[PDB]
Scaffold this active site. Structure first.
Site, PDB file in Angstrom:
ATOM      1  N   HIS A 209       0.809  -1.231   0.000  1.00  0.00           N
ATOM      2  CA  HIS A 209       0.000   0.000   0.000  1.00  0.00           C
ATOM      3  C   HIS A 209       0.838   1.275   0.000  1.00  0.00           C
ATOM      4  CE1 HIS A 209      -3.304  -2.675   0.892  1.00  0.00           C
ATOM      5  NE2 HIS A 209      -2.675  -3.109   1.977  1.00  0.00           N
TER       6      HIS A 209
ATOM      7  N   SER B 247       1.779  -0.659  -5.312  1.00  0.00           N
ATOM      8  CA  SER B 247       0.835  -0.874  -4.203  1.00  0.00           C
ATOM      9  C   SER B 247       0.285  -2.299  -4.278  1.00  0.00           C
ATOM     10  CB  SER B 247      -0.303   0.140  -4.321  1.00  0.00           C
ATOM     11  OG  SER B 247      -1.139   0.105  -3.183  1.00  0.00           O
TER      12      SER B 247
ATOM     13  N   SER C 160      -5.663   1.768  -2.523  1.00  0.00           N
ATOM     14  CA  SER C 160      -5.026   2.165  -1.271  1.00  0.00           C
ATOM     15  C   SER C 160      -3.961   3.227  -1.396  1.00  0.00           C
ATOM     16  CB  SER C 160      -4.461   0.953  -0.544  1.00  0.00           C
ATOM     17  OG  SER C 160      -3.502   0.326  -1.359  1.00  0.00           O
TER      18      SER C 160
ATOM     19  N   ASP D  79       3.146  -7.450   0.811  1.00  0.00           N
ATOM     20  CA  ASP D  79       1.996  -7.392   1.705  1.00  0.00           C
ATOM     21  C   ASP D  79       0.828  -8.059   0.972  1.00  0.00           C
ATOM     22  OD1 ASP D  79      -0.306  -6.653   3.067  1.00  0.00           O
ATOM     23  OD2 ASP D  79       0.297  -4.554   3.388  1.00  0.00           O
TER      24      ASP D  79
ATOM     25  N   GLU E   6       4.137  -9.041   5.173  1.00  0.00           N
ATOM     26  CA  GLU E   6       3.508  -8.119   6.128  1.00  0.00           C
ATOM     27  C   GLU E   6       2.222  -8.638   6.784  1.00  0.00           C
ATOM     28  OE1 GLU E   6       4.457  -5.052   7.210  1.00  0.00           O
ATOM     29  OE2 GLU E   6       2.636  -3.925   7.727  1.00  0.00           O
TER      30      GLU E   6
ATOM     31  N   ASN F  52       4.175 -10.455   9.898  1.00  0.00           N
ATOM     32  CA  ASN F  52       2.850 -10.336  10.497  1.00  0.00           C
ATOM     33  C   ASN F  52       2.888 -10.808  11.933  1.00  0.00           C
ATOM     34  OD1 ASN F  52      -0.133 -11.904  11.073  1.00  0.00           O
ATOM     35  ND2 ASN F  52      -0.203  -9.790  10.243  1.00  0.00           N
TER      36      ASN F  52
ATOM     37  N   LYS G 100       3.933  -6.512  15.686  1.00  0.00           N
ATOM     38  CA  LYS G 100       3.111  -6.279  14.503  1.00  0.00           C
ATOM     39  C   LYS G 100       1.678  -6.765  14.782  1.00  0.00           C
ATOM     40  CE  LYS G 100       1.360  -6.265  10.238  1.00  0.00           C
ATOM     41  NZ  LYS G 100       0.030  -6.825   9.874  1.00  0.00           N
TER      42      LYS G 100
ATOM     43  N   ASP H 126      -0.501  -3.469  15.205  1.00  0.00           N
ATOM     44  CA  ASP H 126      -1.044  -3.062  13.892  1.00  0.00           C
ATOM     45  C   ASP H 126      -2.452  -3.616  13.684  1.00  0.00           C
ATOM     46  OD1 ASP H 126      -1.683  -3.661  11.036  1.00  0.00           O
ATOM     47  OD2 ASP H 126       0.332  -2.930  10.572  1.00  0.00           O
ATOM     48  N   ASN H 127      -2.582  -4.939  13.739  1.00  0.00           N
ATOM     49  CA  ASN H 127      -3.850  -5.589  13.377  1.00  0.00           C
ATOM     50  C   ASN H 127      -4.961  -5.165  14.334  1.00  0.00           C
ATOM     51  OD1 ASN H 127      -2.859  -8.746  11.738  1.00  0.00           O
ATOM     52  ND2 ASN H 127      -1.595  -6.942  12.228  1.00  0.00           N
TER      53      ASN H 127
ATOM     54  N   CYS I  33      -6.526  -1.159  13.273  1.00  0.00           N
ATOM     55  CA  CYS I  33      -7.906  -1.255  12.819  1.00  0.00           C
ATOM     56  C   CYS I  33      -8.903  -0.548  13.758  1.00  0.00           C
ATOM     57  CB  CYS I  33      -8.320  -2.705  12.623  1.00  0.00           C
ATOM     58  SG  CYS I  33      -7.424  -3.485  11.236  1.00  0.00           S
TER      59      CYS I  33
ATOM     60  N   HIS J   8      -7.627  -8.650   3.597  1.00  0.00           N
ATOM     61  CA  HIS J   8      -6.715  -8.293   2.508  1.00  0.00           C
ATOM     62  C   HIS J   8      -7.300  -8.362   1.085  1.00  0.00           C
ATOM     63  CE1 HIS J   8      -3.095  -7.480   0.316  1.00  0.00           C
ATOM     64  NE2 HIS J   8      -3.423  -8.501  -0.460  1.00  0.00           N
TER      65      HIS J   8
ATOM     66  N   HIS K 242      -4.071   2.776   8.633  1.00  0.00           N
ATOM     67  CA  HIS K 242      -3.604   2.987  10.010  1.00  0.00           C
ATOM     68  C   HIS K 242      -2.815   4.267  10.134  1.00  0.00           C
ATOM     69  CE1 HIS K 242      -3.660  -1.659  10.648  1.00  0.00           C
ATOM     70  NE2 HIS K 242      -4.849  -1.123  10.426  1.00  0.00           N
TER      71      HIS K 242
ATOM     72  N   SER L 246       5.187  -1.933  12.663  1.00  0.00           N
ATOM     73  CA  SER L 246       5.190  -2.915  11.576  1.00  0.00           C
ATOM     74  C   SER L 246       6.389  -2.717  10.647  1.00  0.00           C
ATOM     75  CB  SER L 246       3.901  -2.792  10.787  1.00  0.00           C
ATOM     76  OG  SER L 246       2.800  -2.843  11.686  1.00  0.00           O
TER      77      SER L 246
ATOM     78  N   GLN M 137       9.772  -4.698   9.345  1.00  0.00           N
ATOM     79  CA  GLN M 137      10.086  -4.934   7.925  1.00  0.00           C
ATOM     80  C   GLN M 137      11.560  -4.621   7.634  1.00  0.00           C
ATOM     81  OE1 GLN M 137       6.581  -6.403   5.756  1.00  0.00           O
ATOM     82  NE2 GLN M 137       8.809  -6.454   5.612  1.00  0.00           N
TER      83      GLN M 137
END
Ligand SMILES: NC(=O)c1ccc[n+]([C@@H]2O[C@H](COP(=O)([O-])OP(=O)(O)OC[C@H]3O[C@@H](n4cnc5c(N)ncnc54)[C@H](O)[C@@H]3O)[C@@H](O)[C@H]2O)c1
Ligand SMILES: NC(=O)c1ccc[n+]([C@@H]2O[C@H](COP(=O)([O-])OP(=O)(O)OC[C@H]3O[C@@H](n4cnc5c(N)ncnc54)[C@H](O)[C@@H]3O)[C@@H](O)[C@H]2O)c1
Ligand SMILES: NC(=O)c1ccc[n+]([C@@H]2O[C@H](COP(=O)([O-])OP(=O)(O)OC[C@H]3O[C@@H](n4cnc5c(N)ncnc54)[C@H](O)[C@@H]3O)[C@@H](O)[C@H]2O)c1
Ligand SMILES: NC(=O)c1ccc[n+]([C@@H]2O[C@H](COP(=O)([O-])OP(=O)(O)OC[C@H]3O[C@@H](n4cnc5c(N)ncnc54)[C@H](O)[C@@H]3O)[C@@H](O)[C@H]2O)c1
Ligand SMILES: Nc1ncnc2c1ncn2[C@@H]1C[C@H](O)[C@@H](O)[C@H]1O
Ligand SMILES: Nc1ncnc2c1ncn2[C@@H]1C[C@H](O)[C@@H](O)[C@H]1O
Ligand SMILES: Nc1ncnc2c1ncn2[C@@H]1C[C@H](O)[C@@H](O)[C@H]1O
Ligand SMILES: Nc1ncnc2c1ncn2[C@@H]1C[C@H](O)[C@@H](O)[C@H]1O
Ligand code: NA
Ligand code: NA
Ligand code: NA
Ligand code: NA
Lengths: 430, 429, 429, 430
Positions: free
Chosen positions: D53, D76, D81, D129, D154, D179, D184, D188-189, D193, D299, D351, D359, D363
């Protein structure tokens, strides 16, 4: 010439039985184990010595093990956690139990010692919460180790010690880590404490939670639950942590994360959840607000320097059992709960029965696994398989009227998983 | 005549330790003592009190006495007395007639003992629920002219005062303490948010997480109860007759439906309405097995406990104030405190800190009526907002709240008195 | 004379699609149309409106017109107009003078365009913040005798009405819409709970989790803002001058302290007070790097934006209504909407559903003043509780709320009218 | 004869740069990687093709990789996105990027294809990702596999596919599962969200959340965050699940857990979080309340049967980009967001930058690990070591003014752990 049981008052048994009848209807996992296995008796031949808080819930566990064919002898793993009516019901049922609320440390050890010898031989299975029985056997009765098929261990502190034992070459019996079943750690430690911490504080002190600053040392599964409970009643919660990951979680949930050296000046309520020594010390007590309430919910009473209070206070006034109000040389007072022993069990009734059904269904599965399939378990520390972990959760859904979705064939093919699970990889953290 | 009547005077030393701890949580009441013990504004007052005889009430009683009143006391519920608190009061020489587990006839006898003092009949009423107020109006009207004022603690009691006034049957001036801001928006809300769960837990030790809880009514009490239950992971369903309260509950994420539907879903039922006929036989017959049913409103009129006693096939007392019934359909119901208010009947009621708000208002109301009776004609009155604000201000230091002061430039901008009151009379907080 | 003045009439088709969607979220307003479109109670009314020209306001405007009014409109803020909504109104033939990004002189010119209709001057005012009310009283007093009533939307506006009345300078009867229960306890609370975060996010995209947020004021708006920020994991610190509001915030688990202390800790600052001089240069100089500062009160008087413009060493416009300043101390401040109300200036204001509560009250107030003027002498009045309840009831079906009806036995027990109102006039909800 | 970049409007670059300057100050993990490694250039020689993204946050990641010595080409991983001002800033900086908001599916594949070839050879590292780039290379360019040193992946869907590839013997390049770094998945998740779902719904529809019933399909890390966000604004949230453990978590948090077959009759807002096909179907759409808002945050756009809406509706009215209102044959309307593509990135900005710094620091660490220590990583799917995971969290504490406690020597001895960590065993679930 050995005592058959020792409890505070066997006359409490009728009341205990009423509480057990109610608890059974809240514990569908344990009741399902009875339904499935009472006829085939998978634990026949087992002689299980248990060292685990002798509560109403533990009583339901005990009767489940007996229904499945085991002989059992029991003691509590804390001097203040026994519920005397539950102990009475078990004693009246003819099961050897040695447990009462308010044991001395000498009586506590004596009680464990009563559980080692059965009519037909020494123990051959251990069911432990905190590792005291495991440690007693390894240190003082190593000649009994060869006759023990397995250990199942309930709590974070106990499993920490098992891994240490295994890494030092001291462990001589296979063990299952029940604490770290998903359906235990993510439920008991979290949602159990979310309810039972406040229950202990309230029964002891009747203090208002709203408006107070509460300091929670540690933000593991226990501290997460304690913090959420306190915040929910309107306390401002400050967290301490050594682990930057847990600290970051706490900050992202809106809690201030600082050291006890700073937080001791602000807290009205202190709850230690770390499983570590030297958390609340003299230097902290001397800075606390008047009538600060201090308690511990970790397994061993090693977190709070209670000896400092006994040695440095002007006076200790006992308010009622397990509640002491110390008057310090600075003129302020400290309210200490359960002499620093686990507060939920010491000052209230511990976790409610429904979540204990998750933990105790895992315990029964672990005992069956170790007793009936010893070849799957070499000396070392093992987890229950994910399919059994899932089965524990599934057994509790009906009571809650949860309607679980079933994958279609097409979905299961798309995801590359079986329709009946397991549904997550081994590393999944939930 | 008896000096008092309590369960066990031997509990007095323990009771005194509890009172000591509570005083340190009740800065409003302690402030009233600090300010008024020397001047004794309540000198000459003979106060009959009818109010749950708890640790908190003991601190209130000793405050009234410090201020110069003579006091005689009874509880306003047969199960709410804390026997150690009653014993501490009795040991201190105060006439208290109260114990946990009174019969209904004993309950009336206790109120009757508070009417006559050495120097004459009562001249002030301090009431919670209106039983003392109603007793005097209906059975002892000859005493009314000798009574200067009534202060009334709870929503059900003030509702009755307004009804009496509108019917022309109220004969003594009254202050509505329930509707001080620092009472209704704190005691009824935050107090129940802690003490409902306490009562349910001490009685049953049930897990709240995962349960469906049905709360009838979404007023101040219902709002607190719902928040408490939701906080421990119950799914909470609300019933309401008022579309405004109903919409508030919907906007807070609660399902709002009727008891006729919710009785099929609840594992826990809490009645908060102050209204008769909330949970009936037709509801009990549809409930999930081992549904826990309790009431937190003032009078035991919300749940049809008579129906259970008459229709159950088995009834087992589990322990004091906890009964388990088996119905003809084979399912079980657990009933708390025979339908009397559960927080006081099965636990210790509200914690002391929030009761200091309510009871500071009570002391102010007693002072107002006793020392300024000409300000209060027959009718039902509120304390002034300045006094209401003063109650809140008296509790800030204990919580280490740092209040901002307006500058003179800001107060001029707002057209506001710099020391308050800061809100208009219609403000709802 | 111009038929209207808007940014881009070309936005009308998109605006109409937004209005279509909003109508289906605004059942109160649609109900007013259903009930009153045929009888046209507002026939003869010439309503000048000064109120944020949003999608929601467009639905209100078309409701007034359906009810028979003539309407001319302006926005009450230079940044709050939604140009697609203004275009849809203009395309429909309604005189609207409003666009996003007015100069202050254009803003006044827009209000002045709403004063004169074909048949004569305005005869009703619909105001949000009191600018139209004040303009007529101060600059056009010759028009006052021709104005039947004022209805006023927001706390700052009603505060000004009460001030005018107490000074003897109010000359037209007014209804305080802000203090309908279904406005103050819903719009100000739940509306800001959603739209504050919307404004901050669209402007900055900052993570809320992990931040310290300082909210000045804990009234209805502050309560909503604090809850929103806490919900995403900000640690929220409150400032207050009122000890009652302060104690509420403390009892909800918020630290309450002064701005003088909190300026050292906040990453996000939200002013909700309605008061001048809340965030000053001495605060900005102590703030953490890249602190985001914004205001949600009606007038841009809370934050000293002049200080930043004069004292910063660098000032960069990031995008419309977002400025980043570098101070002499080397740290940065991000200022939203030049200190004007952030939810409307940087996002879309409150969502339509809650605005249907507020705007249903507005339509009722316009009907009351226009058709029953003799009920409303010069002064400031509330709508009756029965109408307030009716507003809430009109929104229940959309949320599938099932309201309980009292039985006749219960209504007799309570001494309550079976169709309401269900609460006494002092009830605070 | 190849395009150097392709973006919507390079003139957006000055605005993009302002947004990047702000994001840098919110991303202390990435900035620390620049501080520590800009001089030594650990990624020198790396030619990283990225498919992720193309947002402001990704722009900060890209410039970090370049600062550390890598050459980079980017596309992307979703057609909606990209943030065009971020893409413009990267293009203006001379980095080949092929990304714009509102690509067609043909343009999307073309963009990935532009990233494969550098001046000095084909790609030799993959940063992915969702697995599209990984899958493209394995399926259509297998001749390039031998020249690729590593893959870092990711997102949950992408790592699911890697494990499937490895179990089917299809994976030919070592991969690191980013992930499932703790810093992460658990941040992140979940917290990402919790903020970005509502942002997407609001920017698209401006709908009130309070009072609505919202149905969240799935209660994994994403669904936990979505549910919490919706509840926080006063929606009543109903959860669907296939996993009895996640279902039990949801019930214990106070949510109704039922099937979509039941929930479709009640929901005003539907959010799919499962990563599974066939979640919201025609039979559900036909039962929904008028103007139900339906979106997906998983996703791939496989969860919602959008084709059913296109084939069965009377009319589709476009409201604005990525918002369509369908009129069904039953007279009711359905509001569909982003044509079923991930709603937080498609309708808002995804996010916020602070959590993406967690995250993306993972990476960068994964790229360094795979590029500089390939011998530690055979073909298979690997995790970053816990010490590095902890280091990611620690790098973000200062920005939040968190004060972390240090163990004393005595405490570290008592716990049997190093003062500097790691502090948890490998199975710890946080
Ligand atoms: N009383 C109960 O019913 C109950 C229930 C479950 C577990 N337990 C006991 O509770 C304790 C904690 O269990 P857990 O599962 O939460 O373990 P955990 O490992 O998940 O959490 C403990 C946390 O304490 C932190 N910590 C360690 N030392 C610290 C220090 N000096 N200062 C601040 N933080 C520190 C760690 O970083 C860790 O995150 C254990 O002793 C366990 O056996 C009690
Ligand atoms: N146990 C305690 O510690 C305690 C504390 C404060 C108040 N109280 C008592 O609690 C009760 C409630 O007090 P409150 O202050 O919340 O009053 P309230 O008037 O604010 O709220 C009661 C609510 O019940 C609703 N209601 C009435 N009849 C109903 C019915 N048939 N079905 C559904 N809803 C109905 C009303 O619309 C109202 O909103 C009163 O009896 C009061 O005296 C008890
Ligand atoms: N942006 C919007 O959508 C929106 C919506 C509703 C109201 N408003 C406006 O928001 C503002 C607040 O409205 P409200 O309804 O919350 O009013 P309110 O009177 O209920 O609350 C304001 C609070 O600010 C406190 N206060 C006053 N001066 C202070 C100071 N110097 N420091 C700290 N606290 C101080 C007061 O004690 C009061 O409790 C008003 O200007 C109103 O018109 C805006
Ligand atoms: N949009 C974003 O910013 C964002 C962020 C992180 C992850 N993701 C994507 O979100 C999706 C979910 O990620 P996650 O980390 O939460 O995965 P997860 O595995 O932790 O959670 C998914 C849950 O869905 C449940 N589920 C599967 N099929 C279902 C069905 N048919 N009905 C109901 N429940 C079902 C599973 O039991 C699981 O608990 C993935 O596609 C991932 O790549 C998106
Ligand atoms: N009621 C209980 N009975 C028996 N054991 C209980 C109880 N509450 C908490 N625990 C234990 C305390 C242990 O630390 C934890 O494993 C938890 O399961
Ligand atoms: N602890 C208590 N002492 C004395 N009274 C108490 C207590 N808790 C609740 N109440 C009363 C019950 C009444 O309904 C309410 O007014 C409240 O103040
Ligand atoms: N969307 C909106 N349209 C029109 N007005 C709005 C909107 N959001 C907030 N307000 C106003 C701002 C005012 O202060 C408040 O009364 C509120 O109703
Ligand atoms: N702003 C963002 N930039 C770049 N990537 C983002 C963003 N928001 C979410 N993601 C991704 C979506 C992926 O599924 C997840 O891994 C998460 O990290
Ligand atoms: Na129990
Ligand atoms: Na008490
Ligand atoms: Na809108
Ligand atoms: Na961003």
């Amino acid at each position: 010439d050995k005592l058959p049981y020792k409890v505070a008052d066997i006359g409490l048994a009728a009341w205990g039985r009423k509480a057990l009848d109610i608890a059974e209807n809240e514990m569908p996992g344990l009741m399902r184990m009875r339904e499935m296995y009472s006829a085939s008796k998978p634990l026949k031949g087992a002689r299980i010595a248990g060292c685990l808080h002798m509560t109403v819930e533990t009583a339901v566990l005990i009767e489940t093990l007996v229904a499945l064919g085991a002989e059992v002898r029991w003691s509590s793993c804390n001097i203040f956690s026994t519920q005397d009516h539950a102990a009475a019901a078990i004693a009246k049922a003819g099961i050897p139990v040695f447990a009462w609320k308010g044991e001395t440390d000498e009586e506590y050890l004596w009680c464990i010692e009563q559980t080692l010898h059965f009519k037909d031989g020494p123990l051959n299975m251990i069911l432990d919460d905190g590792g005291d029985l495991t440690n007693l056997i390894h240190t003082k009765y190593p000649q009994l180790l060869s006759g023990i098929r397995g250990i199942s261990e309930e709590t974070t502190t106990g499993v920490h010690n098992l891994y240490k034992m295994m890494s030092n070459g001291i462990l001589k019996v296979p063990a299952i880590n029940v604490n770290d079943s998903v359906t235990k750690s993510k439920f008991d430690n979290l949602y159990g404490c979310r309810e039972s911490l406040i229950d202990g504080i309230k029964r002891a002190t009747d203090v208002m939670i709203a408006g107070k600053v509460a300091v929670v040392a540690g933000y593991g599964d226990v501290g997460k639950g304690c913090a959420q409970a306190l915040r929910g009643f309107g306390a401002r919660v400050i967290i301490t942590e050594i682990d930057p990951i847990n600290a970051l979680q706490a900050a992202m949930e809106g809690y201030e994360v600082t050291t006890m050296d700073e937080a001791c000046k602000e807290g009205n309520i202190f709850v230690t959840t770390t499983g570590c020594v030297d958390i609340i010390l003299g230097r902290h007590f001397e800075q606390m607000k008047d009538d600060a309430i201090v308690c511990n919910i970790g397994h061993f009473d090693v977190e709070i320097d209670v000896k400092w209070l006994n040695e440095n206070a002007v006076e200790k006034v006992n308010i009622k059992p397990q509640v002491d109000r110390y008057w310090l040389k600075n003129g302020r007072r400290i309210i200490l709960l359960a002499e620093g022993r686990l507060v939920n069990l010491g000052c209230a009734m511990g976790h409610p029965s429904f979540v204990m059904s998750n933990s105790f269904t895992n315990q029964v599965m672990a005992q069956i696994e170790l007793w009936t399939h010893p070849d799957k378990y070499p000396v070392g520390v093992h987890f229950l398989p994910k399919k059994l972990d899932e089965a524990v959760a599934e057994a509790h859904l009906g009571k809650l009227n949860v309607k679980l979705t079933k994958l279609t064939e097409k979905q299961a093919q798309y995801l590359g998983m079986p329709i009946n699970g397991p549904f997550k990889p081994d590393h999944y953290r939930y």
